[PDB]
Write an enzyme that holds these catalytic residues in place. Structure first.
Site, short mmCIF file in Angstrom:
data_model
loop_
_atom_site.label_atom_id
_atom_site.label_comp_id
_atom_site.label_asym_id
_atom_site.label_seq_id
_atom_site.Cartn_x
_atom_site.Cartn_y
_atom_site.Cartn_z
N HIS A 14 44.56 36.85 40.95
CA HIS A 14 44.87 35.83 39.95
C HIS A 14 46.25 35.23 40.17
CE1 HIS A 14 41.58 35.35 37.16
NE2 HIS A 14 41.33 36.64 37.27
N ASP A 55 43.95 40.83 31.46
CA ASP A 55 43.07 41.95 31.78
C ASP A 55 43.53 43.32 31.27
OD1 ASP A 55 41.16 40.45 33.12
OD2 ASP A 55 41.90 40.94 35.13
N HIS A 69 36.33 36.60 29.38
CA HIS A 69 36.60 36.24 30.77
C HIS A 69 35.37 35.69 31.49
CE1 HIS A 69 40.49 38.73 30.89
NE2 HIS A 69 40.04 38.75 29.65
N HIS A 118 44.64 32.28 33.92
CA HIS A 118 43.81 33.43 34.23
C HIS A 118 42.34 33.10 33.94
CE1 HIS A 118 42.95 37.83 34.51
NE2 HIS A 118 41.87 37.40 33.89
N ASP A 122 39.12 32.90 36.47
CA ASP A 122 37.88 33.68 36.39
C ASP A 122 36.60 32.87 36.55
OD1 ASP A 122 38.59 36.38 36.21
OD2 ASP A 122 39.01 36.22 34.06
N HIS A 128 31.51 35.58 37.25
CA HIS A 128 32.00 35.28 35.90
C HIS A 128 31.31 34.06 35.31
CE1 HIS A 128 35.56 38.00 35.33
NE2 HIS A 128 35.24 38.23 36.59
N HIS A 142 30.58 44.38 41.24
CA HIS A 142 31.56 43.43 40.73
C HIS A 142 33.00 43.86 41.05
CE1 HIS A 142 32.67 40.39 37.44
NE2 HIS A 142 33.81 40.90 37.83
N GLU A 146 35.63 42.24 44.02
CA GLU A 146 36.96 41.71 43.73
C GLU A 146 38.07 42.49 44.43
OE1 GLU A 146 36.11 39.28 39.62
OE2 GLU A 146 36.98 41.29 39.45
ZN LIG Z 1 39.60 38.03 37.23
ZN LIG Z 2 39.80 38.25 33.83
ZN LIG Z 3 35.84 40.04 37.50
#
Ligand SMILES: [Zn+2]
Ligand SMILES: [Zn+2]
Ligand SMILES: [Zn+2]
EC number: 3.1.4.3
Length: 245
Positions: A14, A55, A69, A118, A122, A128, A142, A146
């Site tokens: 991010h 987060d 998110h 942010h 996402d 997302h 997931h 990431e």
């Molecule tokens: Zn994220």
């Molecule tokens: Zn997030």
């Molecule tokens: Zn995620």
């Protein structure tokens, strides 16, 4: 995307996306007033705190469910019925940020802008935009995905000054919605029968662990690059709206 380190890009996709977006604004010599980048850097601590806080604390992470998110552009919902989604939430902090900016409260302003960035970030992540969580089948994919992204993101930096200036209207929700639409269209480039099957086999096979990572790389590169361009335009929009003009 990941946001595991508060002030380091290493394991914070991010922050990386925001940083690359700011770089785009810097590389642009025909439309961007560089003093805008100067402010983002002046209040970088708060900007990063906002990006990270999304987060790790309430109300931002919705009691560890991260419902705000997510945002599916087709039904306008997140993965939990009745919960607040990324579009309305990203817009919320975009406005709160602008209001504080006008009131000359810079710490408050850039902290809120960080949060907004942010949420916009996402929806650029296909999962997302399709309500595919770490509990969706195959579960665990997931987070693994990431985390993988962090190991290759640096290979997909936008190196020109072409952000998506005025990509959408003046309403931040339009930008969030628009990004989610494109991201959802790319969903199958990351989540499909193949990546699902190989990820499950990756549990015991190194060959398959490398196979799913390889498979999702091309689309990951696309998503990361678009995220940079959209975010740059979004930031530009923010300053145009509240930067006294
Ligand atoms: Zn994220
Ligand atoms: Zn997030
Ligand atoms: Zn995620």
């Amino acid at each position: 995307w990941s946001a595991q380190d508060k002030h380091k890009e290493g394991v914070n996709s991010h922050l990386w996306i925001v940083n690359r977006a700011i770089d785009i604004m810097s590389r642009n010599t025909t439309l961007v007033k560089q003093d805008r980048v100067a402010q983002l850097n002046e209040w970088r601590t708060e900007l990063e705190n906002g990006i990270y806080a999304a987060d790790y604390e309430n109300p931002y992470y919705d009691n560890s469910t991260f419902a705000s998110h997510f945002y599916d552009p087709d039904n306008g919902k997140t993965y939990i019925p009745f919960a607040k989604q990324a579009k309305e939430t990203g817009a919320k902090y975009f406005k709160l940020a602008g209001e504080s900016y006008k009131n000359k409260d810079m710490k408050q302003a850039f902290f809120y802008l960080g949060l907004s960035l942010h949420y916009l970030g996402d929806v650029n992540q296909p999962m997302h935009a399709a309500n595919f969580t770490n509990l969706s089948y195959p579960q665990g994919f997931h987070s693994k995905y990431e985390n993988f992204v962090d190991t290759i993101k640096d290979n997909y930096k936008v190196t020109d000054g072409n952000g998506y200036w005025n990509w959408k209207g003046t309403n931040p929700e339009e930008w969030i919605h628009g990004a989610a639409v494109v991201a959802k269209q790319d969903y199958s480039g990351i989540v499909n029968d193949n990546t699902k099957d190989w990820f499950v086999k990756a549990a015991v096979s190194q060959e398959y662990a490398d196979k799913w990572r390889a498979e999702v790389t091309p689309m990951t590169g696309k998503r990361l690059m678009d995220a940079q361009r959209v975010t740059a335009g979004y930031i530009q929009l923010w300053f145009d709206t509240y930067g006294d003009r």
